[PDB]
Design a protein around this motif. Sequence first.
Motif, mmCIF file in Angstrom:
data_model
loop_
_atom_site.group_PDB
_atom_site.id
_atom_site.type_symbol
_atom_site.label_atom_id
_atom_site.label_comp_id
_atom_site.label_asym_id
_atom_site.label_seq_id
_atom_site.Cartn_x
_atom_site.Cartn_y
_atom_site.Cartn_z
ATOM 1 N N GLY A 3 0.791 -1.225 0.000
ATOM 2 C CA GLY A 3 0.000 0.000 0.000
ATOM 3 C C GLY A 3 0.822 1.272 0.000
ATOM 4 N N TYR A 4 2.112 1.185 0.323
ATOM 5 C CA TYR A 4 2.974 2.369 0.260
ATOM 6 C C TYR A 4 3.312 2.728 -1.179
ATOM 7 N N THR A 5 3.734 1.733 -1.964
ATOM 8 C CA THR A 5 4.033 1.966 -3.368
ATOM 9 C C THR A 5 2.757 2.234 -4.156
ATOM 10 N N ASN A 6 1.678 1.522 -3.825
ATOM 11 C CA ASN A 6 0.390 1.611 -4.493
ATOM 12 C C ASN A 6 -0.365 2.899 -4.152
ATOM 13 N N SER A 7 0.094 3.661 -3.158
ATOM 14 C CA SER A 7 -0.534 4.933 -2.807
ATOM 15 C C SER A 7 -0.398 5.975 -3.907
ATOM 16 N N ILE A 8 -1.441 6.797 -4.086
ATOM 17 C CA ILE A 8 -1.307 7.894 -5.030
ATOM 18 C C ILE A 8 -0.350 8.963 -4.498
ATOM 19 N N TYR A 9 -0.085 8.975 -3.183
ATOM 20 C CA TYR A 9 0.696 10.045 -2.556
ATOM 21 C C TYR A 9 2.185 9.802 -2.658
ATOM 22 N N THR A 10 2.600 8.653 -3.178
ATOM 23 C CA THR A 10 4.017 8.331 -3.331
ATOM 24 C C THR A 10 4.352 8.183 -4.807
ATOM 25 N N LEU A 11 5.576 8.577 -5.156
ATOM 26 C CA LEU A 11 6.148 8.312 -6.475
ATOM 27 C C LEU A 11 6.913 7.001 -6.320
ATOM 28 N N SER A 12 6.330 5.915 -6.827
ATOM 29 C CA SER A 12 6.922 4.594 -6.689
ATOM 30 C C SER A 12 7.874 4.357 -7.847
ATOM 31 N N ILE A 13 9.122 4.009 -7.515
ATOM 32 C CA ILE A 13 10.230 4.017 -8.457
ATOM 33 C C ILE A 13 10.785 2.606 -8.583
ATOM 34 N N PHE A 31 -6.446 -1.108 -5.595
ATOM 35 C CA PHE A 31 -5.490 -1.325 -6.669
ATOM 36 C C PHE A 31 -5.374 -0.071 -7.523
ATOM 37 N N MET A 32 -4.152 0.416 -7.761
ATOM 38 C CA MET A 32 -3.973 1.695 -8.441
ATOM 39 C C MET A 32 -3.202 1.541 -9.747
ATOM 40 N N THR A 33 -3.628 2.317 -10.759
ATOM 41 C CA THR A 33 -2.857 2.381 -11.994
ATOM 42 C C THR A 33 -2.512 3.813 -12.372
HETATM 43 NA NA NA Z 1 2.686 5.424 -5.349
#
Ligand code: NA
Lengths: 4, 473
Positions: free
Chosen positions: B199-209, B425-427
């Motif tokens: 849920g940290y990477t999948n959050s809209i509030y984070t730029l997951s790299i 689930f986020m895209t």
């Molecule tokens: Na994210």
Amino acid sequence: XXVX
Amino acid sequence: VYQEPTDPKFPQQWYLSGVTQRDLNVKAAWAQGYTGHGIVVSILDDGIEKNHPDLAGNYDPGASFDVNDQDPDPQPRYTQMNDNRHGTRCAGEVAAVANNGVCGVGVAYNARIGGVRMLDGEVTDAVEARSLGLNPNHIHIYSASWGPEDDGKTVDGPARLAEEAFFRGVSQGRGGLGSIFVWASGNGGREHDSCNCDGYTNSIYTLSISSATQFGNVPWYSEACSSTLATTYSSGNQNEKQIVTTDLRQKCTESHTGTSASAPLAAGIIALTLEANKNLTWRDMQHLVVQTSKPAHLNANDWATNGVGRKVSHSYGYGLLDAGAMVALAQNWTTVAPQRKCIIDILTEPKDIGKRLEVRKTVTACLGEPNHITRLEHAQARLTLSYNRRGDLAIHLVSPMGTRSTLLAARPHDYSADGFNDWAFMTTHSWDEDPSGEWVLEIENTSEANNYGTLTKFTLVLYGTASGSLVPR
Ligand code: NA
Ligand SMILES: [Ca+2]
Ligand SMILES: [Ca+2]
Ligand SMILES: [Ca+2]
Ligand SMILES: [Cl-]
Ligand code: NA
Ligand code: NA
């Protein structure tokens, strides 16, 4: 859990 | 004329600049005058060696705290195994000092660098929240190279205090422009993990790299998922070079590796971008990443062109960060409009999953209302479902513009019977598309077993605006  | 660093290991920092084009184009940003002056980055990890010869000149006590021992000093705990070297390695990637005869240089070698010591102990929700919410009007950018276990069976995200910290950060942090949270997408590649189950990477509030190897391949440790936004270089096989940074005990290492190295490099590039335009909001920064990142010569078998002509991959998001393009585009960037949120409750009755379930729904995306969205940012399929063996499920979401996002790939090690409880689930793959029209959710059993379950809730959550679109790529 929280892993590096 | 710009003079590149003279540091002894700078020639080994192949990912920062080169004639080969296999780099993050950081020297171009430096030559434009951006080295991170005035920007504050904090490494949330196991501590930071604040007296390191390549960090002391940039160290910022205001960006640092020790949440594990409840004191101001984030100095790592020294042990024979050097367990607590991880935060110091991440910090040097962001902001190792330049032209000082020591090791190499940070991406933002004139930025201020701090650390929160928060992994060396029991990492509770409260610990995470106190770290994510540290001095949010002083720290601009938070970098996190940690998260839930990468065993390929865990589904875990921020609990209440940590999620509240994310919302407070993006809403009131940085003077109301919003804290920038940079996340490493994970090391679960060998376990066939999915970074949408984090849920940290999948959050809209984070730029997951995510990461790419020197030769442009998907590293063994990489997790694929639709929430990833972009990529930076990291390690690969033993013929491919690795990451050069500050190490514990005042040493220099040329062998920093894995997902852990990619987020700090991104944090450094974002620091250069913020120097170029300090008024960028948290959402502005994601737009810049989407528009400027480069797919070229990253190898993957799932590259797809989305509805606005941008190439996107579940291994790489929109591709490699490009620091020179980021800082150039930032300078005259027009702030995006306020974020709208359109909530569409899709189901009229529960649906048995069986071997395969397809749910089709035509939506207006809040037409005629103040939250009408014609320009998508993130989209979520918030799903509640029971299933007897979770890892046999594969879930896809198709946008009206025809972009197929893999929300969940099969996870061979996920034997759980607990299903998904309103899991969002986020895209990122439909960014800038018009979300009006037919959406399709596909849920299928990827195994030959006679599995069973029921989908009881499917909320399509659209975020975005109704103005300011670019001509498609
Ligand atoms: Na994210
Ligand atoms: Ca301490
Ligand atoms: Ca140096
Ligand atoms: Ca993972
Ligand atoms: Cl929200
Ligand atoms: Na705000
Ligand atoms: Na449409």
